[PDB]
Every structure is written in structure tokens, then in C-alpha cells.
Amino acid sequence: TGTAPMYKVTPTTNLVLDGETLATIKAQDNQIGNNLSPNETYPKKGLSPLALNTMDQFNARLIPINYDQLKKLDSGKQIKLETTQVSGNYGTKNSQGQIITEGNSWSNYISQIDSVSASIILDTGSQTFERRVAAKEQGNPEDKTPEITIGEAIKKAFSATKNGELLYFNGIPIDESCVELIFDDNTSEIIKEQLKYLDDKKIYNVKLERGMNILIKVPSYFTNFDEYNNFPASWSNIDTKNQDGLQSVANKLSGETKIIIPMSKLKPYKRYVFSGYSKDPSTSNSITVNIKSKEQKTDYLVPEKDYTKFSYEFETTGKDSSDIEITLTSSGVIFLDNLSITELNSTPE
């Protein structure tokens, strides 16, 4: 899922069963992939997965387990596989003009790349792309790394197209208001502070810094009331005759709005996030948020003068379970735009 191919791929894997590591296996001649291009797999899409069944250096010794581990396996426990490190080579040119990969170890650069870069991951639901973007050291006067914003870094890393004020990766809008942004504690801390000194409060305008971890998640469901609406059902009590929207039009909520999400349209035992943008010039009205799911929660939202983003989490249990309900009601007059449902990590069953 990177930007460069890897030659002579030699991963190392841990086999874990019920809190114990059965074995740590490094790939050998029978398990080494010659070529691995970005966005590709070894073996290829139409081929069967390769077999790892040896633990020695010469592919002559099988991987054993003891009696207790076998009994645990026969009792329904499952073995998990983890990747600890991957070895590979890159290509260069010699004096004879031939491409040379031997002796060009990717491990010689992994630590250096991770030390001077920030990590940006993009998840469009079906694919994942990981990128490293260089940033300067905070305190070094001799570091001459150019400074770019978060949006500029995203555009550079993912080759996004700028058709104006819009960002498209492969036809999917990856704008700040159309995607879900996830950070760790330190990144959240710098991002929120920097914003408090900017005329705009757009995170995409925040200067990128070394050590940041950014995750962009394209929404499973999204609606902007202009051209795109892919919700499993139709929203009740929608007002489209408006011009005060985030991009083109808004949804002035006069009353109660409810949606019906069938359980077959959502993955079981997963945590989902419902997000939206609200605006109320009067700054007096309030909104009630209620979601019927595995657990039902009730919350109150106080809008601001301009558009602000609200997000609430919920969970699911079982494929053949009760339906999903989401309702939004306002006492007075509010505006709603860019309503999205996104899938977070999978809660264990």
C-alpha cells in the first residue's frame, strides 16, 4: 500500500494462540516474493495464497505445536498472524546501465524515513494508502525543509486533483468537510492550538509538522443535498429550497427528521459514527440527537453562529438483529448539511 515496489519480499510473522506466540517465522526461498508493486499482492489477485509450513532456514522442518495447543485449537480457538518486519530491496543503476537490487536494503532507510516524516493514511472503505511527508525539525535553525499545509501535503502525497476549492483522489471527494479525520493525542493537541490563531479554522490550513499521524476515512454514507445521496433509505421531512448551505444548499429542519437504516445495510459488531454540519444565526435554538441501536443514547447540541461539525458514536450487535434508527429534531430553526455515516474499527464480539 506504499509508493514504491519491493524486491525480494521477506516478511517476518508471529503466530499467536490465546496469548502465547507459537512461532516467529521468517520467509525463506519458498516464501519470498520476487516483485511486489504498489497496490498489488503476492500472489496476484487470481492466484491462491502461498503456503507457510516450514520454520527452518532450508524449508525442511515443519512448525510443531504441543498437546495443549492442539486441544485449544480443537476447542474452537483460532490462531492469529501478525507481521513484525518486512525485508526487501530497491532498484538502482550501475556504471553498465543495468538495474541492480542486490545489496540495496530497504531496512537501511526505514528508521531515517520514519524519523523525519509525518504519516498520512487514506481509507476509501475498500483500499488503503499510506504516505510519509517530510517536515522540518522544530528547533533546528539549519533545517531547510519547506513548510506546507496539511491540505497541500495530502494533495502532494495522494496526487489529488484541485478543480477549484475541491479535492478529488480518484473521483471521490476528499475535502475536509466530506471526510472523517482521526489523529492521536499529540496531533490533536497541536492541530486544535494552531487553529486558535488562524482567521480560518480549517485543519487543512494547519502547517504540517514532523511526527503527525493523520487518518482520512471516506464516509460509507454521505449526503450534501446537491447531487449525491446514497443512504439506504430516504430522509423524512427534507427542505431543499435553500441557498444557505455549506456548498450549494442546506436542509432547514422545521420539525422532526428520522431515518431507517436496515441492519442488513450495516456490518455487525462494528462502531459507527454519525456526523453532520449545523448552523443557526440566532444562536438560541437547540437540537436533540437520538439513535436507536444496540444501545440508545440521547444528547443535546447547541449550534453556533456559523457551521460547526457534530459527531456521535454507536455500536451494533448481530447480523439478524433489530433495525437502526436515527432521529434529529430542533425546537426552532436550524440548518443541516453534509450528513454522513462512517465506519470505525470493529468492536470484538
Partner 1 sequence: EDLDTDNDNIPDAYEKNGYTIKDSIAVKWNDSFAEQGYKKYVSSYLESNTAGDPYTDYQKASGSIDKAIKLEARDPLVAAYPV
Write down the residue that cell numbers 437504516 correspond to. 261
- Nearest one of 30, 33, 39 to 10, comparing CA atoms: 33
Dihedral over Cα of 190, 195, 198, 204: its sign? positive
Which residue's CB atom is positioned nearest to Ca ion?
245
* Smallest distance from partner 1 to CB 286, Å: 45
By CB under 8 A, name the one of 127, 145, 321, 322 that touches partner 1.
Answer: 145
* Smallest distance from partner 1 to CB 1, Å: 5
Identify the helix (H) or strand (E) that includes residue 213.
strand 213-217
Q: Does 245 bind Ca ion (CB under 5 A)?
A: yes
Q: Does 144 bind partner 1 (CB under 8 A)?
A: yes
Q: Does 287 bind partner 1 (CB under 8 A)?
A: no
Cis peptide before 173 (omega within 30 of 0): no
Interface of this chain with a copy of itself, residues 97 to 116, rule: CB under 8 A? 98-105, 107-112, 114-115
d(CA 115, CA 219) in angstroms, rounded, equals 31
Residue window 90-129: x/- pattern of binding to partner 1, with contact defined by CB under 8 A: xxx------x----x-x-xx-xxxxxxx------------
By CB under 8 A, name the one of 18, 23, 176, 188 that touches a copy of itself.
Answer: 23
Residues 6+ apart with CB under 8 A from 306: 279
Q: Does 170 bind partner 1 (CB under 8 A)?
A: no
* Smallest distance from partner 1 to CB 143, Å: 7
Produce one character per residue of 55-83: b if its CB has 16 or more CB atoms within 10 Å, e if not.
beeeeeeeeeeeeebeebeeeeeeeeeee
Residues 6+ apart with CB under 8 A from 49: 43
Whether residue 247 is annotated as binding a ligand: the answer is yes
Q: Does 82 bind a copy of itself (CB under 8 A)?
A: yes
Whether residue 224 is annotated as binding a ligand: the answer is yes
Write down the residue that cell numbers 433489530 correspond to. 322
Write down the residue that cell numbers 499545509 correspond to. 149
- Nearest one of 215, 207, 150, 216 to 184, comparing CA atoms: 215
* Smallest distance from partner 1 to CB 51, Å: 24
295's grid cell: 444501545
By CB under 8 A, name the one of 26, 72, 156, 309 that touches partner 1.
Answer: 156
d(CA 307, CA 15) in angstroms, rounded, equals 49
For a copy of itself, the closer of residues 47 and 126 by Cβ is 47
For Ca ion, the closer of residues 74 and 165 by Cβ is 165
* Smallest distance from partner 1 to CB 90, Å: 6
For a copy of itself, the closer of residues 82 and 193 by Cβ is 82
Q: Does 170 bind a copy of itself (CB under 8 A)?
A: no
- Nearest one of 157, 187, 160, 197 to 175, comparing CA atoms: 160
Whether residue 249 is annotated as binding a ligand: the answer is yes
Interface of this chain with a copy of itself, residues 50 to 69, rule: CB under 8 A? 50-51, 53-61
The contact set with a copy of itself (CB under 8 A) reads 5, 7, 12, 14, 16, 21-26, 29-31, 33-35, 37, 42-44, 47-51, 53-61, 82, 84-85, 87, 91-92, 96, 98-105, 107-112, 114-115
